[PDB]
């Protein structure tokens, strides 16, 4: 259907410990397809998807070049950043970048992203129009000025409208069997006696893809939320996801409680109850 | 396909 390609990049300085840590992992939707990491981590035994492997060694050498090249920029970035914030050389600092493109069902661009954070706080973002920046603070304004003078938004718009889109299509074609699947959640509700008085009902959704899901408990149809204890959607580890929703119910009153799943790979939003098997 | 950053912050 519709898809997103996103890259998540990191540069963490490590004064007195070694050279900065440079990471760059790419996703199509919720599927990691490519990872670059200055910390090597195995003889190029680096989490590549099968449909990237089919791309030549030229693709791989070139992306590696861009990575090494990017680290170089990011070192300059780190240096300038601590100048802007008057921070000593002694501290460790993190630069992060997040970028990529959202395509529609017709493989054309819906939205382009490109934003930065310094020490886990937003720093600068390419606006939706891909022609302007929002600076989070005074320091980022120096970056913004520097970048409007150097026409960076234009360079980024070019990547987002051109290379990003075009390659995302190439990826989606080559990995259709993986990337176009939508695995519905396998669900069930379990009973967990707390006392004679009370019991936890737990509504489970396992094995789903993509990660986007909605797990809600309801009473007779009337919604909870304040009493529903969600857990954070979590990786199964087989490129699939899990989430559960729990609620505490007085004993005897189980049938009054309904679980409502809603997921992309589910033909119609489903209802579940407890059922003593 | 990775993006190129030619201009630092």
């Amino acid at each position: 259907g519709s898809h997103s390609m996103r890259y998540f990049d990191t540069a963490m300085s490590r004064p007195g410990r070694g050279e900065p840590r440079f990471i760059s992992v790419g996703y199509v939707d919720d599927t990691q397809f490519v990872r670059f990491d200055s910390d090597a981590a195995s003889p190029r035994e680096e989490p590549r998807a099968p449909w990237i492997e089919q791309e030549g060694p030229e693709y791989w050498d070139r992306n590696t070049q861009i990575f090494k090249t990017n680290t170089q920029t990011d070192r300059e970035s780190l240096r300038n950043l601590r100048g802007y914030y008057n921070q000593s050389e002694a501290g460790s600092h993190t630069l992060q970048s997040m970028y990529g493109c959202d395509v529609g069902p017709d493989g054309r661009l819906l939205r382009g992203h490109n934003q930065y954070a310094y020490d886990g706080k937003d720093y600068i973002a390419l606006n939706e129009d891909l022609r302007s920046w929002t600076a989070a603070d005074t320091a980022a304004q120096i970056t913004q000025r520097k970048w409007e003078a150097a026409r960076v938004a234009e360079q980024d718009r070019a990547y987002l409208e051109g290379t990003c889109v075009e390659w995302l299509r190439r990826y989606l074609e080559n990995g259709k069997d993986t990337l176009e699947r939508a695995d519905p959640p396998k669900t069930h509700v379990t009973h967990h006696p707390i006392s004679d008085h009370e019991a936890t009902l737990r509504c489970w959704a396992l094995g789903f893809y993509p990660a986007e899901i909605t797990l809600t408990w309801q009473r007779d149809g009337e919604d909870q939320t304040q009493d529903t204890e969600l857990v954070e959607t979590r990786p199964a580890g087989d490129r699939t996801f899990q989430k559960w929703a729990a609620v505490v119910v007085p004993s005897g009153e189980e049938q009054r409680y309904t679980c409502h799943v809603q997921h992309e790979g589910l033909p119609k939003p489903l209802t579940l109850r407890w059922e003593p098997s | 396909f990775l993006r190129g950053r030619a201009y630092g912050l």
Partner: T-cell receptor, first 118, second 112 residues
Framework: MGVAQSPRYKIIEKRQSVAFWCNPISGHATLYWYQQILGQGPKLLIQFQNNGVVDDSQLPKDRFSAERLKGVDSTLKIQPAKLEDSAVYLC????????????????FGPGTRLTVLE | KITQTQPGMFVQEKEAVTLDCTYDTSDPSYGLFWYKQPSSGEMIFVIYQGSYDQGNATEGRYSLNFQKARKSANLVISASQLGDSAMYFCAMREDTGNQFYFGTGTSLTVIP
């Protein structure tokens, strides 16, 4: 402005050395050195992003070298020159090199004509 | 790989010319660039085409007849002047590649 280069012409005896200077369009982060043999198009020697190398796979091993110490001003050097080095040495600058858009386009300098004589 | 064949090329003044150029890429995204080199061999950039831009590239009297399926990017010089000679170079930038690949170049002499 424009991409500036020095000198325009140079005569060298075989085995001697040459330096070529190049000044990119002010603020261009990318800087390329090309060799143009008579009858051919320019063929990339080495490419710089700011002060760092992007690609030098085609820099003739250990006769050719290049610095761009401060990611502005750049210098190409040939130590032992061979006659075969007689060519025009064009440098060029651009904003970017993998944007995949117009900012990739390379603007060349006037070039230096090198003639290596016996 | 750029292939601009024709050893040389002639045209009448005020007439239009097509300088042939067929590339070989396999990449989904790439760019094509035309450059002219007069006597006093300065490399002047003339026209850019991205494999993905919608309408064909136009710049002054220069025009890029870009045909993606046949993989050709002929330069179209219209209303030709005498100052259009000039060797002309066709160059491809492909995402996967590591340089502008320049062709051997076609020289265009403009007959008055």
């Amino acid at each position: 402005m424009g991409v500036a280069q020095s000198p325009r012409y140079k005569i060298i005896e075989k085995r001697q050395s040459v330096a070529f200077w190049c000044n990119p369009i002010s603020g261009h982060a990318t800087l390329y050195w090309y060799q143009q043999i008579l009858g051919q198009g320019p063929k990339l020697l080495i490419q710089f992003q700011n002060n760092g190398v992007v690609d030098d796979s085609q820099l003739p091993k250990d006769r050719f070298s290049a610095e761009r110490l401060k990611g502005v001003d750049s210098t190409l050097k040939i130590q032992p020159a061979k006659l075969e080095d007689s060519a025009v040495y064009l440098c060029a600058s651009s904003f970017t090199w993998t944007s995949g858009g117009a900012t990739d386009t390379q603007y060349f300098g006037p070039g230096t004509r090198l003639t290596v004589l016996e | 790989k750029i292939t601009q064949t024709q050893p040389g090329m002639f045209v009448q003044e005020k007439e239009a010319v097509t300088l042939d150029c067929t590339y070989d890429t396999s990449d989904p995204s790439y760019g094509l660039f035309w450059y002219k080199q007069p006597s006093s061999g300065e490399m002047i950039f003339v026209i850019y085409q991205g494999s993905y831009d919608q309408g064909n590239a136009t710049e002054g009297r220069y025009s890029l007849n870009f045909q993606k399926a046949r993989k050709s990017a002929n330069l179209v010089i219209s209303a030709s002047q005498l100052g259009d000679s000039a060797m002309y170079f066709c160059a491809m930038r492909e995402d996967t590649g590591n340089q502008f690949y320049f062709g051997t170049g076609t020289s265009l002499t403009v007959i008055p």
